Amino acid sequence: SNKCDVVVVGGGISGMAAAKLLHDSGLNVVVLEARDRVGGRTYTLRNQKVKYVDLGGSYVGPTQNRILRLAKELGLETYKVNEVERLIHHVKGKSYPFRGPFPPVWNPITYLDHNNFWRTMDDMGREIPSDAPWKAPLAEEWDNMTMKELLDKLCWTESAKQLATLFVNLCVTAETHEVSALWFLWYVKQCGGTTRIISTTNGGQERKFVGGSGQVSERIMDLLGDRVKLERPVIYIDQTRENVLVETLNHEMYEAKYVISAIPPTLGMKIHFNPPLPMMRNQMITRVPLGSVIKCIVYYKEPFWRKKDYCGTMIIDGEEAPVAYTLDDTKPEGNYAAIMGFILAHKARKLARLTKEERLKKLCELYAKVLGSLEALEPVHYEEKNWCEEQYSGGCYTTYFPPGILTQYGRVLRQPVDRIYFAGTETATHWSGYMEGAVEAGERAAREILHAMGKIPEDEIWQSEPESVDVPAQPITTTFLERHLPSVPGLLRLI
Template identity: 40%
Template sequence: MSPRRDDVIVIGAGLSGLMAARELEAAGRSVRVLEARDRVGGRTWTRSLRGHPIDLGGQWVGPTQDRVLALARELGIETYEQFDRGRKVMELGGQRSTYRGLLPWVGLGGLAELGLRVGQLELMARRIPLRAPAERADASALDGQTVRAWLDRRVRNPKARAVLRIATEMVFAGEPEDLSLLFFLFYMHSGGGFVRLTSIRGGAQAQRLKGGAQGLSRRMAEALATPVEHGQAVHAVLQEPEGVVVHAGNRSLRARHAIVAVPPALAAEIDLGPARSERRRRAEQGMPMGSVVKCIVVYPRPFWREAGLSGESISDGEPIRATFDGCSPDLSFCALVAFVIGGSAGGFGARPSEERRALVVEHLVRLFGAEAAEPVAYEDQDWSQEAWSRGCYVGLMRPGVLAEVGNVLREPAGRVRFAGTETAARWCGYFDGALRAGERAAQEVLEAMRAEVPGDV
C-alpha cells in the first residue's frame, strides 16, 4: 500500500477525467490521475500523417458547446470552419445523386415525409426532460421500442426511411434496431435536436480544432500539478469508512474519494464491491459501445471541391456510411474522411489493412469519381479493437434500460463519483458533455469534502 493518501483519485485521463482533476486542483485539492493507456485523450487521438495532424477519434465542435469552446479558447487552441461548400453526394440502393441543403432529394413525396418526420422527432425529443428522461409518463412505452420499430411504423416512403436510418447510424455509430427510442430522443434533445446533430453549419460538425482534438487533453494534463500516471488499469475501487482504496495492477492507493471517468461498459469491469447497486449493474450492462472505423484518405488535390462537391456524402452501400472533407485550411493536406459504422464496422475491421483500403477507395470512386482511385496515403482506426474504449463513439442504451435505471449512471456509489460523457445531461456523447460531466463530478466531491470537515473550503 502506497503511504501517500490523496484527496481524490481520478480514473481515466480522457476529457472528462482531466476536467475533473483540473477543477479539484483549482480548489486546492490533491489529485492523482490513473490512466490505463500510454497517452491521454481517450476517445480523442491525434496522430501525424505526412506531417499533418489527423484526428482518428472525435474532431468537431459547434455552437452551444460552450464548455469545449471556452476550454479551447483558454488553452489557446484555435478553431476553423468545417468545409461545406458545394453539392453533397447520396448513394441509395446503388443509385448516385447530388443535392444541396440539409435534406437529400428523395422524390417529392419522400421529401415531404422526411421533413414531416424530422419535425416530429424534433418535437418528441424536446419533450424528454434532460435531467430525468425516465420520469416522463410514457417513458416505458418509448423505451420499450427500438428506433427501427418507430421508423418502420411511421415512415412509409422507403427512401425517406433509408435516409433517416443513415442519419441515425451516423449520429450514434449504432444500428436503429439496437437503440432504445427513449435514449435516442434524450440524446437528440441533449445535443439540441436532430437538425443540430446532423448539420455542419450551425451544427455539431461546424468547426475543427487546429492541431487536433487531443490537444485539449494534452494541454490540460500538462497543466496539472501532478503528472498523469500511465499504464495504470484500475480493476477495483473499494471503500473504507474514511476513504477509498484503488487497485491498479499490484498497486493499492488510498484517497478520500474517487471519480470514475471511463465509459459505462468499461466501468462495469471495475470491482466496486457492495457499492455497485443492481440498477447500476443493469445500466452498465445495457449500454454497450457503438462501432466505428474512421478512415482518412489523402489525395494530392481536393479534386471533389474542383468538381463543385463539398466532400460530404451519405450512402446505404458498403462499407462507407458517410464522408466529409478533411483538408487543412491552407490545402497543404487534402483528404476525405470516411466513416464505417455499426454492423458494417465489425466485418470491415477484421479484414487486413490493404483490403480495407481497397474497399474504401472503391466506394469513394463510386461516390466522387475516378480521381478518388489514386490516394497518396490511407490510415484508419477501428475503435472496437481498442481495449480501453471497446468501441465508439459512445455507450448506446438498449431498449428497456433507461426507463428502469433512470439517472443511476451519474449517481454516486458511496465515496465514488462518476464522470464521462455518458453521464452528461447536455451534449451527452460529445466532448462538451464529457467536460460538463467532469465539472459536475468534481463539484460533487468538493461538496462532500466540505460536508465531511465543516469549515473546510
C-alpha cells in the same frame, strides 16, 4: 500508499476536465489512466504524411460552449470544416448534389414522408427532459420499442426509412433494432434537435481543432505533470475505511477522500468493488454497450472534389457501400487533402476481417463512384482506427441503451456510490456522447465533490456556460410548410 484528496479514474477529456477544476481549486488530484496515453476516445496521430489526424472524436460546433472554452483556455484554435461547395446524396447508384443540411426529395409523397419524419423526431423530443428522459410522459412506451419499430410505424416510404436508418447508424454507431426509441429521441433532443445534430455549418460538425482534439487531454496532462499516472489501469476500489483505497494493475495503491469515475459506464465492470456496488448499478454496467465504428481517412494530392463544386460531404445510402458518410478532412491551408469516412455499426464488424489495404481499395472505389472522379483511385496515404478493438473504450462514439434499459436503470448513471462520483460524457445532459458532454460531466462531478467538502453551495454544482464569442450559434428555424404539411397518413385522412 500514495495519498491525495481525489483520485480521477480515466484521463479522457472528462477525467482531465474534472482533475483540472479540482487542481485549480487547490486540491491534490491524481489521474489514473489505463493506457500509455491520455485522451481516451480522442486520439490525434502525428506523422509527416498527415501532419496530424484525429482518429477519434474531432468535431465541435455552436452551442458546445464548454469544450470551446476549455480548449481556448489551453491555447487551441478552431477552423471550419469545408462546406463551401455542394453536398452529395448518393441514392440507387447516382449522386444528387445539394445545399442545405437535409438531403432533398422531389416526389411529393416522399417529400411529405421525409418532412414528417424529421419533424416527428423533434416533436417527440420536446416531451423528453434532458436531465431525466425516464420522466417523459410516454417514457415506458417509447423505451419498450426499438428505433427500427418506430421507423416502421412512422415511415410510409422506403426512401424515408433508408435515410432515417442512415441517420441512426451515423449518429449512434448502432443499428435501429439495437437501440431504444426513448434513448435515441433523448440523444437527439439533448444535442438541440435534428437540424443541430446533422449540420456542419451551424451544427455539431462545424469545426475541428487546429493540431487535433487530442491536445485538449494532452495539454491538461502538461499542466498536471506527474499527477497523471499512465499505464495504471484501476482494478479495485475499497470504500470500507476512513479513506478510499484505489488499486492499479501494476500493484500501486492510492488513498483519497473521494473518487471520480471518468470511464464509460460499462468499463466499471473492470473494477472489483468492496463493498459490492448497489444492485441497480451492478446490473446497469452490464446493460450499456458502446457502438461500433472504423474511422478512415484517405489522403490525396489535392482536394480534387472542390473542382467539381463538391465540398467532400457524401451521404451514401444502402447496404453495399462500406462508408455511409464522409466529410472533407483537408487542413485549413488546403494541404494534406483528405476524405474522412465512417464504417458504421454492422459494417464495422463485417469489414474488420479485411486487411487495411483491402479497406483502402473498397473506400477509393466507392469515392470514385460517388465523386465521379478517377482521382479517388490515386490515394497518397491512409490512416484508420477500429474503435471496436479498444479494451479501455469498448467502442465509439458512445454508449447506447437497448430497449427497456433507460427507464429501468437510467436514474443510476450519475448517482454517487458513497464517495465515488460519476463523470464521463454518458452522464452529461447537453451533448452527451461528445467532447462537450465530457467537459460538462467532469466539471459537474468535480463540483459535487467540492459541495461534499463544504467548499461551494448546492446551487453551484450545475453551472451554465456563457456562449462562445468565436463560435456563436445561429437560431434553428423551420418554414410554414415544414411545420404544417401533412404526413402521408394525414394526406390520406383528407381522402
